[PDB]
Amino acid sequence: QRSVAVWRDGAAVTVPAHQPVVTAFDLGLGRGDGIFESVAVVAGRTPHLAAHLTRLTRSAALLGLPAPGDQAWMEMVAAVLADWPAALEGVCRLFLTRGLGDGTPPTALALLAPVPADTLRQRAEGISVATLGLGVPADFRAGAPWLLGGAKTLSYAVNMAAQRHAHDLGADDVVFTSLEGRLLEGPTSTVVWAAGGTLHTPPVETGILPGTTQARLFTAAAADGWPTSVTPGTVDDLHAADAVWLLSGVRGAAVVHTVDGVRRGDGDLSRRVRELLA
Amino acid sequence: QRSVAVWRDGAAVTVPAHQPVVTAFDLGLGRGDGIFESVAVVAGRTPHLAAHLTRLTRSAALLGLPAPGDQAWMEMVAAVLADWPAALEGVCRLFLTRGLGDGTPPTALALLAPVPADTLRQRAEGISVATLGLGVPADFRAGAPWLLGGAKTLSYAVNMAAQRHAHDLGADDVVFTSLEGRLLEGPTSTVVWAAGGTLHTPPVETGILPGTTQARLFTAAAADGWPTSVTPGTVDDLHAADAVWLLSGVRGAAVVHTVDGVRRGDGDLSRRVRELLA
Ligand SMILES: Cc1ncc(COP(=O)(O)O)c(/C=N/Nc2ccccc2)c1O
Ligand SMILES: Cc1ncc(COP(=O)(O)O)c(/C=N/Nc2ccccc2)c1O
C-alpha cells in the first residue's frame, strides 16, 4: 500500500494514493522546480527525520523556495504514518514545489510506499556500480550556484538516465566522476571506501549533497576510533580500496562488489560499518 | 484562462485547469522523468504543430518513453483549443511522463495558457542576456547520452535557477557556455547572430536542442539568398556581431540588445529575420 498527505489551509490532509494531487501547471511537474527528501520508515518510526528536515531546509534555501517549517512536515509525516504497518520498512518522500509560481503558495506533499524488495536485496547482497562522467571539473560547481550542486531537486531526469545506462551495461548503480576523474557521488548515494585503516568520502566543496547516512557513519566511526577523512579520490582509489560502499537514506549501506566490471572484496569491513550505522 | 486535457482510455478528456491531474507517485513530478514540447497557438491555430511533434518523438526516444503517437497529441491539442479565443496568443505544452513506472502507462497531458505580456514585450522590445557556464566541454555530451543533451525534459530546475541568477544580475535571459567558452544555447532558446553577411548558430553536436524557430529561419534565409552557417562561436562572437537574437517557439525572435551588461545594436537586421520567420 501507499499513502499521501497534502498541506491544505495549514493542515495535513490524507488522500487516497491513486488520487491526483497536482494540477498541470504545478512547476514541480512541468519544470522539476522543487525539492525532496526521502525519510526511512522503520518499525512505524522515522529515526532520522530531524536530519532530513535540516537538509530539506537547505535545499529549499538553494532554490529560494518558501518552506512550511518543521512543525508542518512532522504533521504530514504523522498523517501518512497513521495506518502504516510497523513490519513494513517504508520510504516517506517529502516534496516541495514552487507551485503555480512564487507569489502563490508552494505545494507540499508527503508520500509513503514500501521500500522495494530489490532495494532490500541490494542492502543484503551488495551492488555492481558503473562510473559515469558528469563532464564538470571537480572545482566548477562551487563557482556556479545555478547548477544547484548541493540541492536535492525534483529534476532527476539525468540521475534516472544514468541509472538506466548503468542497468543496460549490467550494473546496479552509478558513481559520477568529474572531468579529471575525481569521485563525486551517486545519482542517489554517497560513496565511501576503506583504505590504509581510514574511512574516506569525497569532498562536497565539489558541489555534491551532504549525505546523512554518511555523516552518521563518520560520527560513529570517529567515536569508535576508526579514522575518517575527506579524500579527493578517483576510480583508482575505488579499485585499490579494502572496501567500497554506497550510502543512502533508503537503501542504507550497500557494499560495492563490482566497479566497472572489476570484482572486489570488502576485507570483512562491512560488519563494523553496519554495527556503527545501527 | 487556461485549459487542460488528459489522455484517458485512448481519448482526450477536458478537465478544469485548477483540477489535480497527476498523483504523488508520477515520476514526472517526483523525478522530472518525462519530456515536453511548447506549441504556439496563434489565431486559434497551431501553425508549427507537426514540427514540435517530430521533436517530442525524438525527446521521448532519448528517454525511452513510450509515446502515444501524432493522432493522440493532435486530439489533445484539439481538446484544449476547443474554447480558446482566436485573439489570445497561447502556449500549448504537451507533457509525457514515465507515469508510475515503465510497465504501467505513461501520463500524457496538454495544457494551454496565454503567452504572458512580459514575453510579448520581450518579442517587441528585445532582451538583456547573461552568459553562464554549464561546466561541460563543448564535445562532452556527444559521448555521454545519460546527460540527455538533445532531449527537452520535465527536469528544468537548473534552467530555472540559471534564469533567476540572471534576473538577480539585472538580465532577462541566459546563454550557456561550455568550459572553453563556446556558445551552447538558452535554458529555453537558440542563439543566432549575424556577422560578415552570414547568419550563424552554434553546432548541436555539442549536445543542445535542435530549435524549430531557428530551423525555420535558416530554411527561409537560404531561400532568400542570406548565407547560413553552423559556427562554433564564443561570447566574443556575440559582442562582435552585427546582431544577436534568442529564438524560441513561444517568445519567437527576441533581439539581444545587451550581452553581460555590454549594450549592442542590431544593424537594422531584425526586420528581415522577422519577415523570414513570418
Ligand atoms: C545526489 C545524492 N547524493 C546522496 C544521497 C545520499 O544521502 P542520504 O544518506 O541522506 O540518503 C542522495 C539521496 N537522495 N535520496 C533519494 C534520492 C532518490 C530517490 C530516493 C531517495 C542523493 O540523491
Ligand atoms: C534548451 C532549449 N533550447 C532551445 C529551444 C529553442 O526551440 P524552439 O524554437 O523549438 O522553441 C528551447 C525551448 N524549449 N521550449 C520551452 C522551454 C521552456 C518553457 C517553454 C517552452 C529549449 O528549451
Q: How far apart are CA B214 and CA A30, in angstroms?
A: 23
Cell 521500500 -> residue: A115
Cell numbers for B90, please give them: 497561447
* Residues forming beta bridges with residue B42, ordered by sequence position: B45
Q: How far apart are CA A41 and CA A24, in angstroms?
A: 30
Phi-psi region of A72 (alpha: psi -120 to 50; beta: other; left: phi over 0): alpha
Cell numbers for A160, please give them: 534516472
Burial code (b: 16+ CB inside 10 Å, e: under 16) for A87-102 equals eebbbbbbbbbbbbee
**Scanning every residue of chain B, which has its alpha carbon at the shortest distance from the alpha carbon of A102?**
B164
A26 to B29: CB separation less than 8 angstroms, yes or no: yes
Which of A137, A148, A161 is facing B146, going by the closest CB pair? A161
Q: At what angle do helices B212-223 and B49-62 cross, to 10 degrees?
A: 130
Q: How far apart are CA B46 and CA B75, in angstroms?
A: 13
From the number of C-beta atoms within 10 Å of its C-beta (0-12, 13-18, 19+), residue B100 rates as: middle
Q: B190 by DSSP, 3-state: which?
A: strand
Strands B262-263 and A90-97: unpaired
Q: How far apart are CA B264 and CA A53, in angstroms?
A: 47
Shortest Cα distance, chain B CAs vs residue A165, angstroms:
6
Is residue A241 within 8 A of residue A259, CB to CB? The reply is no
Cell numbers for A148, please give them: 544547484
Which of A34, A111, A134 is facing B25, going by the closest CB pair? A111
Q: At what angle do helices A270-277 and A212-223 cross, to 10 degrees?
A: 100
Tell me how crowded residue A167 is: count the other CB atoms within 10 A of its CB: 14
> What's the length of chain B?
278
Q: At what angle do helices A49-62 and A70-81 cross, to 10 degrees?
A: 130
B152 lines ligand 2 (CB under 6 A): yes
Binding residues of A for pyridoxal 5'-phosphate, by number, are 55, 156, 212-213, 249
Strands (E), A75-195: 90-97, 107-114, 127-133, 173-177, 190-195
For chain A, give every residue range classified as CATH 3.30.470.10: 3-114
Cell 514540435 -> residue: B52
Tell me how crowded residue B16 is: count the other CB atoms within 10 A of its CB: 10
**CA-based end-to-end distance of chain B:** 27
Which of B31, B144, B161 is facing A156, going by the closest CB pair? B31
Quick check: B2 contacting A, CB < 8 Å?
Answer: yes
Q: How far apart are CA A163 and CA A156, in angstroms?
A: 11
Shortest Cα distance, chain B CAs vs residue A126, angstroms:
24
From the number of C-beta atoms within 10 Å of its C-beta (0-12, 13-18, 19+), residue B179 rates as: middle
Is residue B93 within 8 A of residue B76, CB to CB? The reply is no
Q: How far apart are CA A79 and CA A52, in angstroms?
A: 17
List CB contacts (< 8 A) between B28 and chain A: 29
Quick check: A51 contacting B, CB < 8 Å?
Answer: no
Binding residues of A, by number, are 55, 156, 212-213, 249
* Residues forming beta bridges with residue A108, ordered by sequence position: A96
Q: A165 by DSSP, 3-state: which?
A: helix
A22 to B24: CB separation less than 8 angstroms, yes or no: yes
Cell numbers for A263, please give them: 570484482
Rounded to 10 degrees, the C-alpha dihedral B11/B12/B13/B15 comes to 160
Q: How far apart are CA A140 and CA A247, in angstroms?
A: 24
Cell numbers for B178, please give them: 561550455
Mutate: best of B1, B23, B102, partner A, most A CBs <10 A: B23
B59 lines ligand 2 (CB under 6 A): no
* CATH fold for the domain made of A3-114: D-amino Acid Aminotransferase; Chain A, domain 1 (3.30.470)
List CB contacts (< 8 A) between A156 and chain B: 30-33, 155
Strands A173-177 and A127-133: parallel
Q: How far apart are CA A24 and CA B110, in angstroms?
A: 8
Is residue A115 within 8 A of residue A252, CB to CB? The reply is no
Shortest Cα distance, chain A CAs vs residue B198, angstroms:
32
Residue type, A79: A
Cell 517587441 -> residue: B124
Instruction: Read off φ and ψ for residue A203, nearest 5 degrees.
Output: -70, 150
The alpha carbon of B247 and the centre of ligand 2 are apart by a number of angstroms equal to 8
List CB contacts (< 8 A) between B179 and chain A: 137, 140, 179
Residue type, A175: V
Angle at Cα B101 formed by Cα B95 and Cα B104, nearest 5°?
A: 90
Q: How far apart are CA A158 and CA A135, in angstroms?
A: 13
* CATH fold for the domain made of B120-277: D-amino Acid Aminotransferase; Chain A, domain 2 (3.20.10)
From the number of C-beta atoms within 10 Å of its C-beta (0-12, 13-18, 19+), residue B101 rates as: exposed
**Scanning every residue of chain A, which has its alpha carbon at the shortest distance from the alpha carbon of B4?**
A24
Residue type, A241: A
Is residue B91 within 8 A of residue B250, CB to CB? The reply is yes
Nearest to B10 by CA among B71, B77, B86: B71
For chain B, give every residue range classified as CATH 3.20.10.10: 120-277
H or E element: which one contains A168? helix A157-169
Method by which this entry was solved: X-ray
H or E element: which one contains B167? helix B157-169
Resolution in A: 1.8
List CB contacts (< 8 A) between B95 and chain A: 24, 29-30
